[PDB]
Structure formats: structure tokens, C-alpha cells
DNA sequence: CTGTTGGCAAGCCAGGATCTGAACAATACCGTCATCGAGCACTGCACAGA
């Protein structure tokens, strides 16, 4: 569960070794963090999936509250309130709503990691120029970050695949902080311009399936439905166990 | 064996005009994204029975 388990990748903004911190650790302390990832693109994938994270489970009430928490860390306590009613969407492995994913997906076989690997595959050069076996085995940190990435950032896998809500690659540009806990606080807006700015389906797509070639008018679209929207129909198979993520 | 020297080298004036210098037609195409499942091929597989 991307609310309760570690999964998140940091190592401190001036430190040294990574380590995988949980989505309360990062909300409880004056630890200062800076995201760690091989990639660019993941790093920022990953914010903006903490982003939209904590746009759902705590938008500040005022300007006030917002600058606070800013400065200030929530306690334990404050944190588990907030987070208490959307554990439920959160499950990568999950019965009936698996996070970002549809289950009941007929296909003959099965896809490798690497397609959602965002430029490792995708043009026929791909297999010449880049290193092999980048999408082996993910951890699960990295295959959510994948995922999201593919529903924000990158084009769809081919024909019959839809892009995300922007469209195809559009430029994501997030406000800049010091650490990550406050980058992450400084790009949630508050509850009056949440309001302001979306003036409806509230509930996700692996929650509230998409109809197949119904037509959306874009104003009947949640926000939390539109900031975790899934284009694709995707579904994770059964992980492995121990070793190196690759 | 022995072969020279001085003194001197110009000035005037004059070089053109006419009129003319192009047009047409034509400049390419292919491949270097991907997806899914189906319909339809090499291609070995032993055999059973010929």
C-alpha cells in the first residue's frame, strides 16, 4: 500500500546512501530528503505521484494553514487521520480494485516490464542502442512510478491504447522546495482553489471502471478520478521474491 | 710582357561618338512508431503401416 509501506526512494538532500523511506516518514519529521532514482523521468514521476497524493489526502483549508505546514511537520497522529479513508485505492495487489490497473485483462501474453520502462522500447533502434534487462524484475516502488508515468507522461504502448488526459507527453512543471517533503506540500493546492479550479465522478478508474467507447464530457471528471486517471487497460501480474530491483 | 680617359643623353601637344544585352519547360519516391488477433506459411515429429 503506497500510503503505508516503504517504497518511496530518497536519500538526504546533502547525505549519501538511498534508503526507502514510507509515506508517513516523509510527513512526520524535519528529515530532509531529495528523491533518488537512476532516471530523470522517474524522479519526477514519483513527485508527481506523491503530489497528487497528497492533493487528495491533505489540501490546507486556507493560505494560513498552508504556509504552516510548510514550516511545520504533522504529527503521527494528524497524518494517519488524513490517509485513514484512502488506504482502500492504494493496493498494488489488491481483490477487485488493484491500484491503477484492471483486472480481467484477456490477453494471450504477457507484456515485459520494460514497456512501461518509457524509452527503453518503443522505436526499433531501442534494442540496439540500450542496455538489456532493464525491466526484469521491478521493485514495487518503481512499478508504480512506471505506471504513473505512463498514464501522465508517456505516449501510449501503441494502436488501440489511449494517452493520458494532457495528452500525449505533455510538459509537467511543478513548483520547486527545498526537500521533498515541502516540494511535495508546495504543489498541493489549497481547498479554496480546489474548488476554484474545478468547478462529477469522483471515484477512480480501477474503482469506477471507464465504459468502453463511451463518450466523457471532460466536466464530469472527479479530481482525484482525473489526477489518477488510467487511459489503459493494465493489469500486474504475481511478483517474485527476494533480489535486486533491476 | 703590356688594353685609356672626359663630356654629353630634348622639348611641345593630342586619346571619339552611336546603339544594342532573350525566351521556354522541368526539381521525385521509399523505409528506418507501436498495438492486437486472426488467417495462413516453414518445419521438423516421430511414427504405423505401407
Redesign the pocket.
Known amino acids: 500500500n503506497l500510503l503505508i509501506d516503504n517504497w518511496i526512494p530518497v536519500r538526504p538532500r546533502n547525505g549519501g546512501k538511498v534508503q526507502i523511506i514510507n509515506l508517513q516518514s516523509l510527513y512526520c519529521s524535519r528529515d530532509q530528503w531529495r528523491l533518488s532514482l537512476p532516471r530523470d523521468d522517474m524522479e519526477l514521476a514519483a513527485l508527481a505521484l506523491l503530489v497528487c497524493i497528497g492533493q487528495i489526502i491533505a489540501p490546507a483549508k486556507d493560505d494560513v494553514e498552508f504556509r504552516h505546514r510548510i514550516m511545520n511537520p504533522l504529527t503521527e497522529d494528524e497524518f494517519q487521520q488524513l490517509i485513514a479513508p484512502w488506504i482502500d485505492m492504494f493496493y498494488l495487489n489488491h481483490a477487485e480494485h488493484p491500484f491503477m490497473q484492471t483486472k480481467g485483462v ?4 504477457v ?1 515485459p516490464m520494460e ?1 512501461l520502462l518509457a524509452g527503453v522500447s ?4 531501442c534494442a540496439f542502442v540500450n542496455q538489456p534487462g532493464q525491466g526484469e524484475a521491478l521493485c514495487g516502488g518503481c512499478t508504480a512510478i512506471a505506471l504513473f508515468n505512463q498514464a501522465n507522461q508517456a505516449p501510449g ?5 489511449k494517452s493520458g488526459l494532457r495528452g500525449g507527453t505533455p510538459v509537467t512543471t511543478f513548483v520547486r522546495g527545498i526537500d521533498l517533503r515541502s516540494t511535495v506540500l508546495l504543489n498541493v493546492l489549497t481547498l479554496p482553489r480546489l474548488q476554484k479550479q474545478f468547478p462529477t465522478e469522483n471515484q477512480p478508474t480501477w474503482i469506477k471502471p471507464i465504459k468502453s467507447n463511451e463518450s466523457i464530457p471532460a466536466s464530469s471528471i472527479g479530481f482525484v478520478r482525473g489526477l489518477f486517471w488510467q487511459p489503459a487497460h493494465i493489469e500486474l501480474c504475481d511478483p517474485i521474491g527476494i533480489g535486486k530491483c533491476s
Open positions: 484477456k490477453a494471450n501474453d507484456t514497456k518503443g522505436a526499433t533502434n504502448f501503441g494502436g488501440g491504447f
